Amino acid sequence: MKQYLELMQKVLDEGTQKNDRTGTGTLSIFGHQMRFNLQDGFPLVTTKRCHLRSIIHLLLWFLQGDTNIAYLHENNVTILDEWADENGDLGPVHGKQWRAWPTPDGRHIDQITTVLNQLKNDPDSRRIIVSAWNVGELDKMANAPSHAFFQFYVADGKLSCQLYARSEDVFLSLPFAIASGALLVHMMAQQCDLEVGDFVMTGGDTHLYSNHMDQTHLQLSREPRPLPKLIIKRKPESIFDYRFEDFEIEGYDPHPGIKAPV
Amino acid sequence: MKQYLELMQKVLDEGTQKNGTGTLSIFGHQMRFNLQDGFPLVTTKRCHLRSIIHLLLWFLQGDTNIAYLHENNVTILDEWADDLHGKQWRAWPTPDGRHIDQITTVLNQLKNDPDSRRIIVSAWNVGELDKMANAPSHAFFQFYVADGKLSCQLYARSEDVFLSLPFAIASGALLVHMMAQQCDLEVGDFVMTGGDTHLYSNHMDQTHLQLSREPRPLPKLIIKRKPESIFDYRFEDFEIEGYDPHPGIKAP
Ligand SMILES: CCCCCCCCCCCCO[C@H]1O[C@H](CO)[C@@H](O[C@H]2O[C@H](CO)[C@@H](O)[C@H](O)[C@H]2O)[C@H](O)[C@H]1O
Ligand SMILES: CCCCCCCCCCCCO[C@H]1O[C@H](CO)[C@@H](O[C@H]2O[C@H](CO)[C@@H](O)[C@H](O)[C@H]2O)[C@H](O)[C@H]1O
Numbered sequence: 001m002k003q004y005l006e007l008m009q010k011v012l013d014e015g016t017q018k019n020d021r022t023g024t025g026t027l028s029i030f031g032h033q034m035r036f037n038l039q040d041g042f043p044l045v046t047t048k049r050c051h052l053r054s055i056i057h058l059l060l061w062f063l064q065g066d067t068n069i070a071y072l073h074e075n076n077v078t079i080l081d082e083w084a085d086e087n088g089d090l091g092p093v094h095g096k097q098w099r100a101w102p103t104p105d106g107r108h109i110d111q112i113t114t115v116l117n118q119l120k121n122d123p124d125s126r127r128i129i130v131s132a133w134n135v136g137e138l139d140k141m142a143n144a145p146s147h148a149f150f151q152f153y154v155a156d157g158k159l160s161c162q163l164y165a166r167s168e169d170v171f172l173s174l175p176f177a178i179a180s181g182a183l184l185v186h187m188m189a190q191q192c193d194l195e196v197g198d199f200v201m202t203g204g205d206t207h208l209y210s211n212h213m214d215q216t217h218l219q220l221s222r223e224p225r226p227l228p229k230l231i232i233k234r235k236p237e238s239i240f241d242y243r244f245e246d247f248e249i250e251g252y253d254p255h256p257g258i259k260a261p262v
Numbered sequence: 263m264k265q266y267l268e269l270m271q272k273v274l275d276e277g278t279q280k281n282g283t284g285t286l287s288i289f290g291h292q293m294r295f296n297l298q299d300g301f302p303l304v305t306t307k308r309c310h311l312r313s314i315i316h317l318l319l320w321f322l323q324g325d326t327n328i329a330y331l332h333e334n335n336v337t338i339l340d341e342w343a344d345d346l347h348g349k350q351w352r353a354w355p356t357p358d359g360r361h362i363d364q365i366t367t368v369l370n371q372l373k374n375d376p377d378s379r380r381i382i383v384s385a386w387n388v389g390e391l392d393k394m395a396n397a398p399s400h401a402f403f404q405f406y407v408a409d410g411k412l413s414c415q416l417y418a419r420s421e422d423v424f425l426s427l428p429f430a431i432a433s434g435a436l437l438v439h440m441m442a443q444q445c446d447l448e449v450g451d452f453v454m455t456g457g458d459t460h461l462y463s464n465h466m467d468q469t470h471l472q473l474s475r476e477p478r479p480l481p482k483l484i485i486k487r488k489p490e491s492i493f494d495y496r497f498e499d500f501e502i503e504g505y506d507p508h509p510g511i512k513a514p
Contacts, residue, residue, distance in 0.1 A: 030406040030413050031453035033292040068389050098488045103389035109386065119275055122282060126420040126458045127397050131386050135354045139362050144380050149402065151457045153289040153421055155278040160289045162457060166418060167379040197373055200290035204404045205379045205416060225390040 001043055001226050004178075008170055008216055011208050018207065023249060027120055028207035038196040043182050044249060045175040049257040052249045054079075055179040062095035062180075063112070063240060068180025073099040075244075079176055083143050088093065091143040097132040115152055123154035147177055152188070154160040158197030159189040166204040172211045172260060173217075175199065176227050183247075191239050215258050228252035263302060264477055265293040273461050280460070283418055287460035289437060294326070296433065297449035300480025302435050304331025304428040305442060306472045308510035311502050313338065314432045320495065321433075322365065322493055334497065338429065342396055348396075351468070368405060369492055372445040376407035400430060411450035412442045419457040424465045424472075430454065434499075439483055444492050468511045479484045481505035 015027030036043040044050055057075040064071075069080060069088040084094040101109040111130045118128045133146040149164040163181045168174050182199045189196045208216055231248040267292055272375045272503075303309055313369055316334045327345045339347070353361040371381045375499025384402040384416040391397050403416045416434045421427050435452045440450045484501040 016410045020379065021377065028408060031292065031294060031409070031415050031451065031455070033290065033455065035290060076502075101388045102357070104355070104359065106387075109388055109392060126399075129386070129401070129419060131384075131388055131401075133382070133384050134389075135350075135362055135384055135387070135400070136356045136389075140325075145380075149386070149417070151350070153458055154289065155287065155289065162290050164455075165381060200292065202290075202417075204294065205406060230296065259264070 001036075001045060001047075003036070003087045004045060004174070005047065005220055005224065006173075007032060007157060007174075007206070008208065008220055009035065011206065012216065013172055015208065016257075018205075026207040026208040027210065028205055030205055032202050032206045036178065036201070038102055038182060038185060038199055041110075042129075042186075042230040042249065043178050043199065043254060046176070046225040046227070046252070046254045047118035047222045049254040050175050050179065052179070052247065052252075053244070055176060055183055056244050056247055058176065059180050059183050060242060060244070061204075062098065063242075065094070065096040065099040067094050067096055073118065079173060092132075092138060092141055093133075093143050093145050095132065097134055098130055101134060102137070112239060116190075117161070119152060119154060119194070123194075126154040129156075146173075147173065150181070154194060155197065157195050159185055159186050159192065159194040160197035160200065162202060163205075164202045164204070165206075168203045168206045170206060170208050171215055173211075174206075183230070186232065187242060190232060190235060196201075211261055213238040215261070218258060222255045223257075225253050225255070226251065233252070263295075263304060263306075263480070265295075266304060266423075266427070267306065267473060269293065269459070270461070271425075273423055273459060274469065275323035277461065280343070285460040287458055289458060291454075291456040291459050293382075293435075293454050294450045295431070295454075297435055297438060297452055301429050301483040301502065302437075302452065303493040303505060304431070304482055305478040305505075305507040305509075307428075308507040309428055309432065311432065311500065311505075312497070314429060314436060315497050315500055317429070318433045319495060319497065321351065322495075323350035323402075324350075333420070338425075346396065347398055349391075350387050351383055353365075354369055354384075354387060361475040364493060366386075369441070369444065369508070372407060372412065372441060372447070373403060373432070376445075376447075381405040383405060384513045399450055403434070405438075406450070407447060408450070410447055412438055412445065412447040412448035412457055413453065414438045417457070418456050418459075419460045421456045423461050423471060425457060427454075436483070439485060440492060440495060443485060443488060465513055468513050471511055475508045479504065485501065 018028040054077045069084040113118045117124050130147045146167045151162050153160045228249045228251045234246045313336045316336045368381050385398040386401040400418045403417050482503045486488045487499045
């Protein structure tokens, strides 16, 4: 998409050399924001082939708050493989917190259910928020989630959402993030009888890995095609009751896929 | 500032009416300030670095009672008190019932691992915010170091453009300067990111007044002294130079 390519180009034009924790090099910039008017079409990247199938399972899996990579491997989803251990446990890199923010008093807070009510009963609340950033638990932990904060907002019957990522690989994860947020907004809006507004995507450390230069140049050589449209073929009883089969993407004509290197 | 004015204009132009008190509002904004281009104190109305310095300093002590904020005459946050903000920066409670000093945490990270992609302070403790009533409006921030330059991004879930935002920008930039000093880094950018970004309908007159003024050159922040720690700054360590704003605008 136009915005997306502009970001790649901006990283190339003005990104700074910065290493990650492995010592592996990137071109990085800090602070970025883009907006996708979801009435204009579902923001699935067209300049490389992406797979809605992967976005759906990933999102249904976050929604369950499953902590084991199993379900993701059944359905051929691998973006989280790096952070999985020996027995496929993802540490804190998952969505348990969304549904079961533990509080020391033997208690658990279901954040998703809370936004759901807020959108129906107080759509103007300035704090319709989900956070996975549980400092108390993340403290002495090797890993940490990266898309750990989102906010909803309602104006004129339309539902909008903003996702903050502290770390974003422009080539690898950003397209997943965008479609995943967009998908949730459609599901949220269906459940709450709202129409869809904007999806706003906000970054901290936004970066391209140095060894993805070839992939990036190829993708920047290609013209974005018209956005597809998401079709939901069932209305489930609750946000947690969706199935892979409910979704279809229409009018998706992408450029060929570009594999990530070794 | 040109960017502040653009946002103010934008909310006037494209803000949705809400309401009981009314607002115009938009969702999602981001603006950037290169701190080497000057200290981003708003000039289209006079602000007082005095009140910003005290406010930030108080946040860093992680004090909950607004005792210090009256002895040094800082009104703002009054309407959110009877006491209330910053206790989570310094003392986020663990299951185990210890506490986590996030400010110390990010301080060590900046000194020992500036590359880190998780140099984050959060005030959004969901477990304590189930108590509705009030909630911090500046949920979290992230620091970032590249090429010996320290940037920071502040996220406001709710922002009053007229009253609150100019304060927010100055405070964040001031914090970047202080940490840059404690970690021996140059200052990079301060990035301001918003969720619900609104103007109150009872601030229109003031808003039109401010949009009618052209910006002036940004001042320069002076730090007179280097304390031993980020908790060791006092109000008198800071000066502002070449600050030449339009007259201040009081809001009702
Ligand atoms: C709106 C609701 C849905 C939210 C969308 C969520 C879908 C996310 C899509 C792809 C997810 C993977 O992407 C993301 O995961 C990693 C772990 O958190 C991040 O990795 C980051 O955190 C890890 C810590 O455990 C570190 O080892 C990495 O060096 C660091 O960069 C990646 O930098 C980021 O690309
Ligand atoms: C990185 C260092 C800087 C960190 C702090 C930055 C400066 C803070 C001073 C700004 C003054 C107040 O700003 C902010 O206060 C209120 C509560 O937090 C917010 O108020 C918000 O939350 C309240 C309580 O949950 C609600 O009653 C309001 O509906 C909601 O708008 C204001 O919308 C916002 O304007």
